[PDB]
């Protein structure tokens, strides 16, 4: 950050030269630039001069040397500190032109599909002005549309589209309808939350996997009176039960006068009438299935337990399996070069390093934050503080003052919204429902006498001016002192308190902010003994002792460390599965170069090269020979999964929470893999030999509902 301190006032020298350019010269000028070198380069200076030249000109905003530097360090491959007032938007832009500039393509992970489409659309021109094309990604978005959208030099898009579009190119039939491109550039928007926070958190693309009410009915009719119909075998009690003649023929007219035994039922309605037969007759509800909930259990061969289901009668339906899942680290850790910024990154630099690979450039202010903060106000019980914090919100909504309040849940803002009206406080909450209605609300937060409720990620992106957006409020709203930020508790990470202390002194503006904790509270408790703290109550609850600051920063600390060894220990699976995914992804894409075919001409062939002089077409034939091949992959696969979950799940059980280093995971993982490929390629020959419908993406959240 020395040299390019150094490299930010060097481009002084092309200031008039630049706002001499008419529109046409500047796109060529940008045009005309070595910077393939990146950050370090010659025609830097030159840049961050255009760059400048043609914000003032296209948004108008004159961007700071500070917002130069936060760029240049992002070209130089860093996760910025850059704070909420400071232009993260216009500094990330100026950055994805270097990098575009340089042949590259940049992909702004704005983790938000609102910030997506509004940072392209603001972006977009000072861009166009420079010669670059801007993209942008929704989760509605075709995928013509997404193509299209990254074709363009910049692409905006949430951490979850650019997820499941990698996950979506998995139900790809065929190389032209294949969406997703090369990962190049990643410039990450709130690198701290995606990076860090998010990184454990799959994305996972799930698909819906029905015999005769009439067959099914048949059997039950057939069972019920004195039978002789079937034949249950007795070179082994417990295999499957054959068919009698006579039986066969009550089946065969009960069905209207069909031939079980011909090709249109052979595999078909004599399977339907076997399979129902087995659960009727050798499977009943003692020491076979039971049931216990809505389902059937094992004290599962093809098709049997939906006739197991349909024999009891509990009918159901919904099951959605893992067909592809990938994590956001596994997925940014595959772009040749990581970038980023936010408010908070210091404090994760470690872990950033650790696992990306990435160092950590803090930018300093334009104009110096004179936000007051004020130590943690702590309380005995729960009730204590929220007590304590309805009547500090009314004293500081009286004198006019606007605030904005930090909440754990929406259950936990919902209670206080009642407790505020009630007494008087006109509130507002922001249910995370309507990302663009949220950012509306929130741009009128920092009004007279506006009083806005927030969860911990709520109302991200959208800076609260002073006086709504954009007002003359601002000269009143700033003698009352700007805006009052309240916490209603510490969170796991400080990174989290000061993400929303961050939200009040913006361009060296009054503001002001508070944390309420208590000895009640899920981070203090058990994460510190209850013993060592003060007791020492006032009239209204708070601690008399001001020795409080240190005992919850130390109860954090703690909490930091603990989920960073979930983390740890958590990531060595992930990375195992992602190196299995990196080999199914290999042989998914020379099976859309037609390698299939060929694969079936020479593995014995006796039907192919029958399938070649009674051909339908030989042309076909290779979108044929790919049916079966992808179809055994990526079922064999999606089993993997099945089996990685499972064992996953009879491991953290297997152990409650001792968070001992498992091993087993890992040894399983790897056999399980090995005869996957080899067992594909075989699968698939045997389906030649006999001459999806639903699916849907999720990241998953939390453990509520």
Same mark, same amino acid.
């Given at each position: 950050?020395?040299?390019?301190?150094?490299?930010?006032?060097?481009?002084?020298?092309?200031?008039?030269?630049?706002?001499?350019?008419?529109?046409?010269?500047?796109?060529?000028?940008?045009?005309?630039?070595?910077?393939?070198?990146?950050?370090?380069?010659?025609?830097?200076?030159?840049?961050?001069?255009?760059?400048?030249?043609?914000?003032?000109?296209?948004?108008?905003?004159?961007?700071?040397?500070?917002?130069?530097?936060?760029?240049?360090?992002?070209?130089?491959?860093?996760?910025?500190?850059?704070?909420?007032?400071?232009?993260?938007?216009?500094?990330?832009?100026?950055?994805?032109?270097?990098?575009?500039?340089?042949?590259?393509?940049?992909?702004?992970?704005?983790?938000?599909?609102?910030?997506?489409?509004?940072?392209?659309?603001?972006?977009? =021109?000072?861009?166009?002005?420079?010669?670059?094309?801007?993209?942008?990604?929704?989760?509605?978005?075709?995928?013509?549309?997404?193509?299209?959208?990254?074709?363009?030099?910049?692409?905006?898009?949430?951490?979850?589209?650019?997820?499941?579009?990698?996950?979506?190119?998995?139900?790809?039939?065929?190389?032209?309808?294949?969406?997703?491109?090369?990962?190049?550039?990643?410039?990450?928007?709130?690198?701290?939350?995606?990076?860090?926070?998010?990184?454990?958190?799959?994305?996972?693309?799930?698909?819906?996997?029905?015999?005769?009410?009439?067959?099914?009915?048949?059997?039950?009719?057939?069972?019920?009176?004195?039978?002789?119909?079937?034949?249950?075998?007795?070179?082994?009690?417990?295999?499957?039960?054959?068919?009698?003649?006579?039986?066969?023929?009550?089946?065969?007219?009960?069905?209207?006068?069909?031939?079980?035994?011909?090709?249109?039922?052979?595999?078909?309605?004599?399977?339907?009438?076997?399979?129902?037969?087995?659960?009727?007759?050798?499977?009943?509800?003692?020491?076979?299935?039971?049931?216990?909930?809505?389902?059937?259990?094992?004290?599962?061969?093809?098709?049997?337990?939906?006739?197991?289901?349909?024999?009891?009668?509990?009918?159901?339906?919904?099951?959605?399996?893992?067909?592809?899942?990938?994590?956001?680290?596994?997925?940014?850790?595959?772009?040749?070069?990581?970038?980023?910024?936010?408010?908070?990154?210091?404090?994760?630099?470690?872990?950033?390093?650790?696992?990306?690979?990435?160092?950590?450039?803090?930018?300093? =202010?334009?104009?110096?934050?004179?936000?007051?903060?004020?130590?943690?106000?702590?309380?005995?019980?729960?009730?204590?503080?929220?007590?304590?914090?309805?009547?500090?919100?009314?004293?500081?909504?009286?004198?006019?003052?606007?605030?904005?309040?930090?909440?754990?849940?929406?259950?936990?803002?919902?209670?206080?919204?009642?407790?505020?009206?009630?007494?008087?406080?006109?509130?507002?909450?922001?249910?995370?429902?309507?990302?663009?209605?949220?950012?509306?609300?929130?741009?009128?937060?920092?009004?007279?006498?506006?009083?806005?409720?927030?969860?911990?990620?709520?109302?991200?992106?959208?800076?609260?001016?002073?006086?709504?957006?954009?007002?003359?409020?601002?000269?009143?709203?700033?003698?009352?002192?700007?805006?009052?930020?309240?916490?209603?508790?510490?969170?796991?990470?400080?990174?989290?308190?000061?993400?929303?202390?961050?939200?009040?002194?913006?361009?060296?503006?009054?503001?002001?902010?508070?944390?309420?904790?208590?000895?009640?509270?899920?981070?203090?408790?058990?994460?510190?003994?209850?013993?060592?703290?003060?007791?020492?109550?006032?009239?209204?609850?708070?601690?008399?002792?001001?020795?409080?600051?240190?005992?919850?920063?130390?109860?954090?600390?703690?909490?930091?460390?603990?989920?960073?060894?979930?983390?740890?220990?958590?990531?060595?699976?992930?990375?195992?599965?992602?190196?299995?995914?990196?080999?199914?992804?290999?042989?998914?894409?020379?099976?859309?170069?037609?390698?299939?075919?060929?694969?079936?001409?020479?593995?014995?062939?006796?039907?192919?090269?029958?399938?070649?002089?009674?051909?339908?077409?030989?042309?076909?034939?290779?979108?044929?020979?790919?049916?079966?091949?992808?179809?055994?992959?990526?079922?064999?696969?999606?089993?993997?999964?099945?089996?990685?979950?499972?064992?996953?799940?009879?491991?953290?059980?297997?152990?409650?929470?001792?968070?001992?280093?498992?091993?087993?995971?890992?040894?399983?993982?790897?056999?399980?893999?090995?005869?996957?490929?080899?067992?594909?390629?075989?699968?698939?020959?045997?389906?030649?030999?006999?001459?999806?419908?639903?699916?849907?993406?999720?990241?998953?959240?939390?453990? =509520?509902?």
């Amino acid at each position: 950050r020395s040299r390019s301190l150094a490299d930010v006032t060097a481009s002084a020298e092309y200031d008039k030269e630049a706002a001499d350019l008419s529109d046409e010269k500047l796109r060529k000028a940008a045009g005309l630039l070595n910077l393939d070198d990146l950050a370090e380069s010659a025609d830097i200076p030159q840049f961050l001069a255009i760059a400048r030249e043609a914000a003032e000109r296209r948004t108008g905003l004159r961007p700071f040397d500070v917002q130069l530097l936060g760029a240049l360090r992002m070209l130089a491959g860093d996760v910025i500190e850059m704070a909420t007032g400071e232009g993260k938007t216009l500094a990330g832009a100026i950055a994805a032109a270097g990098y575009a500039l340089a042949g590259r393509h940049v992909h702004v992970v704005t983790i938000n599909d609102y910030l997506a489409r509004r940072d392209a659309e603001w972006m977009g =021109p000072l861009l166009d002005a420079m010669g670059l094309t801007v993209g942008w990604i929704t989760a509605d978005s075709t995928p013509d549309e997404r193509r299209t959208a990254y074709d363009r030099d910049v692409t905006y898009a949430s951490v979850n589209e650019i997820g499941f579009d990698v996950l979506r190119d998995q139900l790809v039939t065929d190389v032209n309808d294949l969406v997703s491109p090369n990962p190049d550039v990643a410039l990450i928007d709130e690198a701290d939350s995606v990076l860090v926070d998010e990184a454990l958190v799959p994305l996972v693309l799930a698909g819906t996997t029905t015999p005769r009410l009439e067959i099914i009915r048949l059997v039950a009719e057939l069972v019920g009176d004195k039978d002789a119909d079937e034949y249950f075998a007795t070179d082994s009690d417990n295999r499957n039960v054959h068919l009698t003649e006579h039986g066969a023929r009550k089946v065969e007219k009960a069905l209207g006068g069909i031939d079980l035994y011909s090709e249109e039922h052979v595999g078909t309605t004599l399977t339907e009438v076997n399979v129902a037969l087995h659960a009727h007759v050798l499977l009943q509800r003692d020491v076979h299935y039971i049931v216990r909930d809505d389902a059937v259990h094992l004290i599962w061969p093809d098709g049997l337990q939906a006739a197991v289901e349909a024999k009891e009668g509990i009918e159901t339906t919904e099951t959605g399996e893992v067909l592809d899942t990938i994590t956001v680290q596994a997925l940014i850790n595959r772009y040749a070069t990581v970038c980023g910024m936010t408010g908070t990154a210091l404090a994760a630099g470690e872990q950033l390093r650790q696992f990306y690979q990435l160092g950590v450039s803090p930018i300093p =202010p334009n104009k110096p934050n004179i936000r007051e903060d004020e130590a943690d106000r702590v309380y005995i019980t729960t009730a204590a503080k929220n007590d304590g914090i309805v009547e500090h919100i009314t004293e500081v909504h009286q004198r006019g003052q606007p605030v904005l309040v930090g909440t754990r849940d929406v259950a936990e803002s919902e209670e206080l919204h009642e407790r505020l009206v009630r007494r008087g406080v006109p509130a507002v909450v922001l249910n995370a429902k309507n990302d663009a209605e949220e950012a509306r609300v929130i741009a009128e937060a920092g009004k007279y006498g506006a009083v806005t409720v927030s969860t911990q990620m709520a109302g991200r992106g959208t800076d609260i001016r002073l006086g709504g957006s954009d007002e003359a409020d601002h000269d009143r709203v700033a003698e009352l002192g700007g805006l009052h930020v309240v916490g209603t508790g510490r969170h796991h990470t400080e990174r989290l308190d000061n993400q929303l202390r961050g939200r009040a002194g913006r361009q060296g503006d009054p503001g002001s902010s508070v944390f309420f904790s208590s000895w009640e509270d899920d981070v203090v408790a058990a994460n510190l003994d209850h013993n060592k703290l003060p007791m020492a109550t006032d009239e209204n609850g708070r601690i008399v002792s001001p020795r409080t600051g240190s005992l919850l920063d130390h109860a954090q600390r703690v909490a930091e460390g603990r989920l960073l060894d979930v983390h740890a220990n958590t990531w060595r699976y992930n990375q195992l599965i992602a190196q299995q995914r990196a080999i199914i992804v290999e042989r998914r894409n020379t099976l859309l170069r037609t390698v299939t075919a060929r694969e079936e001409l020479a593995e014995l062939a006796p039907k192919r090269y029958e399938e070649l002089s009674d051909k339908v077409s030989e042309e076909r034939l290779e979108t044929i020979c790919r049916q079966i091949m992808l179809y055994h992959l990526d079922r064999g696969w999606a089993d993997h999964l099945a089996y990685l979950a499972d064992i996953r799940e009879s491991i953290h059980l297997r152990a409650l929470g001792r968070q001992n280093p498992l091993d087993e995971f890992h040894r399983m993982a790897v056999d399980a893999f090995a005869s996957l490929a080899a067992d594909a390629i075989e699968a698939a020959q045997q389906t030649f030999e006999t001459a999806p419908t639903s699916t849907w993406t999720y990241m998953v959240n939390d453990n =509520p509902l």
